[PDB]
Design a protein around this ligand. Structure first.
Ligand SMILES: NC(=O)c1ccc[n+]([C@@H]2O[C@H](COP(=O)([O-])OP(=O)(O)OC[C@H]3O[C@@H](n4cnc5c(N)ncnc54)[C@H](O)[C@@H]3O)[C@@H](O)[C@H]2O)c1
Ligand SMILES: NC(=O)c1ccc[n+]([C@@H]2O[C@H](COP(=O)([O-])OP(=O)(O)OC[C@H]3O[C@@H](n4cnc5c(N)ncnc54)[C@H](O)[C@@H]3O)[C@@H](O)[C@H]2O)c1
Ligand SMILES: Nc1ncnc2[nH]cnc12
Lengths: 488, 487, 487, 488
C-alpha cells in the first residue's frame, strides 16, 4: 500500500486506534478527572447502572466530537458494560489529549484535530468496522455522517449484490461525496456485506444535533431509514441548554482564542435565531457588541426584536459589520458576493454543523485571492481588489470546537445524560416493537430526570408540591409537570 | 359599593353597566393611540372588513376590559359581530375603555373595583342575549364564563329530575357560594338557560394558561360541551404576552402601587414558567437580586442558567423585599410565611387567580389590621409583631390591578390570535370540523401573527431561495419549524 | 387655573398654598412608607435630634415637592429648623405630599400643574420670611431661587441709583419676562429685599447638575453672593440618583404617560452623562434598541462599550419610537426634527429644564393642533403631514411630571447629603470657614452616606486589618479612595 | 560562570535579547499586523508624529506586559524615533511570539512566558542596562518594579559609595526581595554608578496601573521619588476602559482557557469592586453566574448592590462558591484558612497586579498538600484532610495574562495612546520645570483626544455643539467638555 497509508495502531492490549499523539494520555486523564466533577448526570448514571452492566455484550459506535466531555460519556458507556469504537464528527473538533486517554484506557478511537476529509471518512469507516465479531449494536451520532455512511453503504452493497457494480466517484460533482463513494468502493473489497449485516443487527441510533435530526426525518419521510432513531437534540434538557447556553459559552471562547478581538464596541451579525442563534446573540450582546440578526422565520425574528436586537437582511449590514456568525443549519448564508463587500479584517465564522453555511468553495476560487494562515484555524483571505482581508475561522467548520473546546462539561452532561438514557432505552426495548424505523423522542419524565440530576451541584433547592397543589394544576407530585406541548 | 345592578341602555337600546360614562371621550383618545400600536388587529380589519365574516354573529367575551381589549372588541364589530362583554377580574377594568365601548360599540358590564357579587352579575349579563338566544361564540380569559355554563348545565340536569337546587352550604369557598347562588336563582327563572346556551355555542377561544388548564380538565373528564381553541399556547401568545408582557407590566404594577426602588432589593419570584421568566427578567434588569422558587426541575435549571438562585420560600421569607407569585397554582404564600416577612415587604400575585396568596388566612388572622394606603395598596399589620406587609390588589393580578396590564403591541399578538380563533370557529360552524375538544391554531397562522407585527418594528425578514428551502425541508412560505419546535 | 394667589394659613398661623389640603391624610400614609425606605434621613434624625442643631434656623427650599422631599423637610424640622418650601418645577409636585407638609410641618407653596406665573409666585413666597428676615439657609435644585436672589440684587443696585426698573422688553424669553416683572414689582414695595436677604444667607446647598453649573458660572464671574455646597457631585448623589434614579423613573414616566411597549422599539437618548447612562440602561434592559447622541467623545466611547449605537439625531429622527433628552443643554430636539418623526413618536425630556426640546417652535408652528390625551400627555398634529407626535409634560422633566420621580431609597442618598451640607453651612455660620465659593463635601462624609444605606439592603462590609490598610495607604476607617477617584 | 547562567543573545545586527524562541517571530508579525488595525490611536500617533521623529535620541526602557498589544506600542515608540529596551512586568504575561517579533525587528527584549523570579529580575535589570552609552531617558512601567529597582539601586549605591558595603539578602525575609538585593549586589560589580547616572538622566516615568501609581504616591509622600511621574492609569480613557472593559473581556477568557468550566449556573465571588472588580463582576453576571462581591468601601459596596449583586464577607461564602477572583490591589484576601473551607475544585484566581492577594506561601506549606499540575498555569492543590482540591490559576499571578492573552487590542490602544502622549509630554517638556519629582495626570483635552481617536473605527458619530450650545453648558466647542472633577 501507500507510503502515506492510514493504518490503525494497537495498544499493548491489542485495541485499535489512530490518534495524534498517545503521549498526551496523562494530560487527557487529568482533564477528564476534572470534567467528571462537572458532569453529575453522567457520574450518577455510573453509580446507578454500573453494577447491573446494562450494556453487557453491546457494541457501540459513536461519532460525538472527540472532546474531554465525550471522553466522560464514553467512559460512562464502558462503565455500564459497553464495548466502544469512536470517531469525531468534524475534522477540527477533536481534543487530542481526550482522544489519547480514551485510546489508552477505554475504547478504540480514530480521531485527531486537523484531519483531511479523506482521513475523516476513513476514521468514520474504522469506527463502524468491528471486524469479524460484527457490530455495532448501537450508534451514537452527531450530525448524521455515520448514519449516512451506513445508508449509502447498504445502497452500494445492494447494487453490488445485484449487478456486480462498485461505486464511482465520477458519478458525483460534490468533492466530499466523491471521498465517501471511494471509501465504500474500497470497503466492498474487504467486506461486501458489512452494512447489510449492520442493517440487520443495529438496534438504533441516538442523534445529537439539529442537522442530524433533519436528516433522520428525510429518511423517515422517504421510507429509507433502516433502524429506529432517538432524537436526543429535541429533549428539552438538550435543545434548550446545550444549543442555547452551550453556544452562549463557546461562541465567545472561539472568537477570543482565534482572534483575541475585542467584542465590545463591535457590530456582530448572527444569521439565524433558533436555539444556537439565540445563545450566540446573547453572548455577543452580553459582551458589548451591537448584534444584528438575520432570519427567515417571522416568529424567531419577532423574538429577536423583543430582546432589543435589530433584524435586517445580510445585504443591509455586510459592509458595516465586524463579526459574522452563521447559526442556521442551512446552506449558502455567506456567499463570496457578501465577502467581497466586507471591511478589512471582518471575522467570518460558522457554528452550525456543516461548513457549507459559508461559501468556502467560492472564496477559494476567487481570482487573485491569497490565503494567509495566521495560526491553525485562523486564516486571513486577502482580496486583491481592495488589498483587504477577511478572517475565516476553522475553514468554515464549527468554530467553537474548531477554535476552542466547544461547550463546557456541565451543559454537555445534560446532553450526554440524554444520550445515555437514549442508548439504554434502545438496548433495553429492542425485543418489543416499541421502536419502529422511525424517529422518537424521550418521554418527559426522563427529560425532567436529566434536569433534576444537575440541580444539587448548583445548590438549587426544588420545592415539593403538596398533594392538593399537584391536583390543582393537574400534575403528579413526581411529575411530569408540564403538558406534552409545553415549550419552556 | 354605590353601584345599582340594573342595566343601563344607550340611546340605541344596547345594554351596559360601567362606572362612569363621562370617561368615554378619554377612552376614545387612548383607543386611537392603541390602534397604531396594534397592527395585527388593524390588519385583520382591513383584510376581513369587506367580507363582514361575523355578520350576524353574537359574541360574549370576558377578556380584561382594558384599552387593548377595546381594540379587540372593535375589530370584532368592524367585522360585523354584535358583542357583549365583561371583565375576568374585579380590578382589571380600565373605566375609560369600558365607557368608550359601552357608548360606541358593544354592551359592556365592567368596572374597576367590583365586588365578587358584582363580578358574577356582570358575567351573567355578558352571557344574557335575552329571549332570542346566544352567544354564538365565547372569548374567555381564565375560564369563568365557560365554568358558569358547565356548572349551570349540571345544576339544570339535577333540577329537571329532582327539583333540587345547588346549595351554597356544599362549599366553604365564599366565591363559589356566590356562583351557586347565581345558578340557584337562575333555575328559579329559567331552568333550561344553560342547556339552550350550550346548544347554540359554536365554541370558545381561551386566552390564558389557567383557563386552558381548565379546558383540558373538561376534555379529560368528558364534560366539555363545545369546541375550544387554546389561544394561550400559540407561540405568538405564550412566548410573547406571558413572557414579555409581564416583563413590562410587573414593574409597572410595582412602581405605581408602591413607588419602591427595585434596584438593590431582594425579590422572590415563585414559579419560572413564561410569566415567572418575564417577571424575573424585569426584576433582575431593574437591579434586584432575584430568587426563584420552582417545582419543575427543568424550569429550575433554566433559572440557574440565567444567574438566579433557586430556593424554597421558607429559605428567604424573612430576607426578601418583594414577593411575586406566578404559578397558576394555589397556596404559595401562606399566612405563616407572611408573619415572618420584614416590615413593609411587598406581596403580590400576577397569576390568574388570587388564591396563590392566602388572603383568607390574612383577613381572618385575629387582631390583624388593614390600612388602605390607596386603592389596591393595603398595609396589613400583625398584632404579634406590630410590623406590616404590603398586599397589592388584594392578591388579584397585580399588573392589571395596580397598573394597566400589558401594553398594546404585545396584546395585538395575543388578540390577533383570538380573532383568528373566532373566525375559524365561526366559519366552520356548520362543517363538523371541530369536535367537543381542545384545539390549537396551526403553525402557518401562528407565523402570520408574527409576520403582521414585523413592519411596525422595522424588522426585515430574509426570503429563502427554493434551494435553501428544500435543503432544510420547508416551504419557501412556511411553516418553517417542525410541529414540536419550542422556540 | 382656579388658584387664587393669596396665602392660606394653618390653625397655628403658618402660611401655605397647595392644591387640596384634604389630601394630607393620604400624604401622611405614603410618607410613613417612605421613611422606612430612607434610612439615611431617619439615621440623621436619631443622631442629631437630641442636639437640635437647626434650632432657630430658617430654611427655604426648592427641592421638587414629592413624598421624598417631605421626608427631607421633616428631617430638617425634627432637627429644629423652621422651613418654607416650593417646588422647582411646575409639574413635579405631588399634591398629597404638599398637603401633609403644609398641615403638619412647614410652609409649602406648591401644586402639580402650576402656570409659570404661579411657579415664580411660589418661589417668592418660599423666600418671604416677612419683616423679621430670612432665610438663613437655602436648599436649591436647579438654581432658580438662587437666580432670583442674584438678579434681585443686581436690579436693586441699578434702582437705588437711577430709579430704573427691569424692563421685560429686554428679553424675548417669556419666562424671563415673568422673573423681571416679579423683580420690578418687588422694587416697588421693598427696594432692598434681596440686599437684606443676601446679607443673612449663610449659604445654599444645590442638588442638581444644571444648578451646580450655574453656581460655577457665578463663582467664575465673581457674582456669587454666599457660600455654596455642590451636593450633586457627591459620589453618593451623582452616581446614584442621577444614574440609578433615572434608570427607575424614566420607564415609570413612559409607562404611566403612554402605556407604550418599550420592548421592540428604537429609543434615542440624547446625552450619555449620568442621566443618559441611566436612561439608556433602562431602555435597553426593557428590550428597546437604544441609540445615543453625544458631543463628548469619552461618553460616546463608553456608550459603544455598552453595545449602543452612537449617531447624530439627524440620522435616526424618522426611525425612532421614543426620544429622551438628558443633556442639561438646550435646543436638542427642534421643530425641524419633530416634523420628520413617525406618527405617535414619543418626545420627552428628563434634564432639568424644558428648553432641551423646542416647545416654543412647536407651539408657534402655523396650523399645528394640540390634543390633550390626559394631563401631561399631549398629541401634536402637524398640518403638512396630518401625523402627530406625543410630548410628555410639555417638555418638563418627564419622570416627575408624568410619574413620581425617583424612589425613596435613592433620594435618601441624595437628601442625606443635603442634610450634611445644611448642617455644615449652619454649624460654620460664624466661623468664616466658607468663602463665597462652591465647595463639595469631603470624602469621609460621602462614604458615611453610603454606609448608612447598607444595612437596609443586607450588604455586609469587610473590615481592613491594620496591615492591609497600611498596604494600600488608607486608614482602617477611611476614606478609602484618593481624592480624584471616579468610582 | 554558571552552566545555567542567563546570557543575552544578539541579533544578526547586534541587538541584545533573550526570548523563548526566535522562530516564533513570523507568527508574532502576523498577529501584530492584525492588532495594528485594532489599535487606531497608536496608528494615528505614527501617522501624525512619525515624520517629525519626536523621540530622536531618546532611549526608553519599558516593562509593559510583553504581549502583541505591547508590541504595537513598542513599534509606535520606534516609529517616532526612540531606541527601546523592554521586559515584561510578570513572569507569566509574555506572549512569546510577540517577544520574538520585537526582538527580531524592533527592540531589545528580555522576556518569556514562565520565567522564574530570578529570571524576572534579571530581565528587569537587563532592560534598564543600556551599557556604556547610558540610558534610559524615559521609562514606561506597569506596576512599579522597574521604578523600584532604580530607587533601591540608588539606595544601595549610596551605601556603597559612603561605606563600601554591598547589599545582603540575609537582611530580608521576603524571598523575592532577597533576589532583588542579590541582583543589585552583583550589578555593583559591573557598574556601581549605574543607577546614579540614571537618576541624573531620566526625564520621567509613565505608569500604567493602579498598584504602580499607589507606589508612586508612597515615594512622593516620603520624599524619595527621584524623577517626575505621569499617572497613566487615572486617565479616564485608561481606568474607565482598560481596567473595566478590559477585564470584562479577559477575565472570562482566562477562566475558559485555564479550566473550560461553565460559568453559567455557578456562584462566583469577586473580592473588590473598583474598576477591575466592576468589569470582572460584569463578565461573570453576563455569563450567567450568580456574583457575590466583597468590599471594604461602602460606596463601592452600595454600587454593587444597585447592580443586583449580593455583598458579603468572604467568610460568608467560602464554602459555597465555585469561583473566586481577587481584584483588590491589596494583600491577604484569600488565605489558607479560607482555602481549607472551599469545595472540591473551587477555582481560585487573582487579576490584581501582584500574587500576594492569594496566600500562595501558606498553601505551599500546608502539611500534606499535594500540587498536581493539570497544564501550565492550571494547578490542582489537594488538601489531605478532605481529599478535595482547589484549582489555582497562574500560581496566583495575574490570571488574564497568565492563562489567556490579557486585554484585547482595541482597549489597549486606549491605554497605550495615553502612554505615547505621556512619553511625548515628559520628553518634550523636560527643560522647563513643568514636571517636578511628583505625580501628574494628563490634561483632559488629551484624555478626550484618546477617545476621539477610537470612534471612527467603531462607526460612532459625534455631534458638534453649536457656539450657542457650548456657551450654555460653559464649555468650548472643541472641549474639554467636563469639569475637572467629573467622574464619568
Ligand atoms: N456548534 C455547536 O456546538 C452546535 C450546538 C448545537 C447545535 N448545532 C448546530 O447549529 C445549527 C442550528 O441549530 P439550532 O438548534 O439553532 O436550529 P434551529 O432550527 O433551532 O435554528 C436555525 C434557525 O436558522 C434560521 N434560518 C434558516 N435559514 C436561514 C437563512 N437563510 N437566513 C437566516 N436564518 C435562517 C431558521 O429560521 C431557524 O430559526 C444546526 O446545524 C445544529 O446542528 C451546533
Ligand atoms: N489584570 C489586569 O489586566 C489589570 C488591569 C487593570 C488593573 N490591574 C490591577 O488590578 C488591581 C485593582 O485595580 P483597580 O483599578 O480596580 O483598583 P481600585 O482601587 O479601583 O479597586 C480596588 C478595590 O478593592 C477594594 N478592596 C481593598 N481591599 C479589599 C479587601 N480586603 N477586601 C475587599 N475589597 C477590598 C477597594 O475598596 C477598591 O474598591 C490593581 O492591582 C491594579 O494594578 C490589573
Ligand atoms: N392590557 C391587557 N388587556 C387585556 N388582557 C390583558 N392581559 C394582560 N394585560 C392585558
Amino acid at each position: 500500500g501507500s507510503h502515506m497509508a492510514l493504518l490503525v495502531e494497537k495498544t499493548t492490549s491489542g485495541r485499535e486506534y489512530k490518534v495524534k499523539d498517545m503521549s498526551q494520555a496523562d494530560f487527557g486523564r487529568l482533564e477528564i478527572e476534572l470534567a467528571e466533577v462537572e458532569m453529575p448526570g453522567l457520574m450518577a448514571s455510573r453509580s446507578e447502572f454500573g453494577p447491573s452492566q446494562p450494556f453487557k455484550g453491546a457494541k457501540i459506535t459513536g461519532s460525538l466530537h472527540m472532546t474531554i466531555q465525550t471522553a466522560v460519556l464514553i467512559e460512562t458507556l464502558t462503565a455500564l458494560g459497553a464495548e466502544v469504537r469512536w470517531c469525531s464528527c468534524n475534522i477540527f473538533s477533536t481534543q487530542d489529549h481526550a482522544a489519547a486517554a480514551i485510546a489508552r484506557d477505554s475504547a478504540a478511537v480514530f480521531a485527531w484535530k486537523g484531519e483531511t476529509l479523506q482521513e475523516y471518512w476513513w476514521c468514520t469507516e474504522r469506527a463502524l468496522d468491528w471486524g469479524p465479531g460484527g457490530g455495532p449494536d448501537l450508534i451514537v451520532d452527531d450530525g448524521g455522517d455515520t448514519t449516512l455512511l451506513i445508508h449509502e453503504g447498504v445502497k452500494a452493497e445492494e447494487i453490488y449484490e445485484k449487478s456486480g457494480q462498485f461505486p464511482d466517484p465520477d458519478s458525483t460533482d460534490n468533492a466530499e461525496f466523491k471521498i465517501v463513494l471511494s471509501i465504500i468502493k474500497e470497503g466492498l473489497k474487504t467486506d461486501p456485506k458489512r452494512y447489510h449485516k449492520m442493517k440487520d443487527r443495529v438496534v438504533g441510533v441516538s442523534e445529537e444535533t439539529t442537522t442530524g435530526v433533519k436528516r433522520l426525518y428525510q429518511m423517515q419521510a422517504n421510507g429509507t431509514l433502516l433502524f429506529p432513531a432517538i432524537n436526543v437534540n429535541d429533549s428539552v434538557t438538550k435543545s434548550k441548554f446545550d444549543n442555547l447556553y452551550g453556544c452562549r459559552h463557546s461562541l465567545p471562547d472561539g472568537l477570543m482564542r482565534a482572534t483575541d478581538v475585542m467584542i465590545a464596541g463591535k457590530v456582530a451579525v448572527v444569521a439565524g435565531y433558533g436555539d444556537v442563534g439565540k445563545g450566540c446573540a446573547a453572548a455577543l450582546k452580553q459582551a458589548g457588541a451591537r448584534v444584528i440578526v438575520t432570519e427567515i422565520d417571522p416568529i424567531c425574528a419577532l423574538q429577536a426584536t423583543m430582546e432589543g436586537l435589530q433584524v435586517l437582511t445580510l445585504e443591509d449590514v455586510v459592509s458595516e459589520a465586524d463579526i459574522f456568525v452563521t447559526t442556521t443549519g442551512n446552506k449558502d448564508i455567506i456567499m463570496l458576493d457578501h465577502m467581497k463587500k466586507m471591511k478589512n479584517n471582518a471575522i467570518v465564522c460558522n457554528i452550525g454543523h456543516f461548513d457549507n453555511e459559508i461559501d468556502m468553495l467560492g472564496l477559494e476560487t476567487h481570482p487573485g485571492v491569497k490565503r494567509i494562515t495566521i495560526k491553525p484555524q485562523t486564516d486571513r483571505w486577502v482580496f486583491p481588489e481592495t488589498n483587504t482581508g477577511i478572517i475565516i475561522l476553522a475553514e468554515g467548520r464549527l468554530m467553537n470546537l474548531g477554535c476552542a473546546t466547544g461547550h463546557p462539561s456541565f451543559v454537555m452532561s445534560c446532553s450526554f445524560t440524554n444520550q445515555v438514557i437514549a442508548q439504554l432505552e434502545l438496548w433495553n426495548e429492542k425485543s418489543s416493537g416499541k421502536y419502529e424505523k422511525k424517529v422518537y423522542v424521550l418521554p418527559k419524565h426522563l427529560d425532567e430526570k436529566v434536569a433534576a440530576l444537575h440541580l444539587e451541584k448548583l445548590g438549587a433547592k426544588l420545592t415539593k408540591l403538596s398533594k392538593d397543589q399537584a391536583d390543582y394544576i393537574s400534575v403528579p407530585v413526581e411529575g411530569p409537570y408540564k403538558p406534552f406541548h409545553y415549550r419552556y
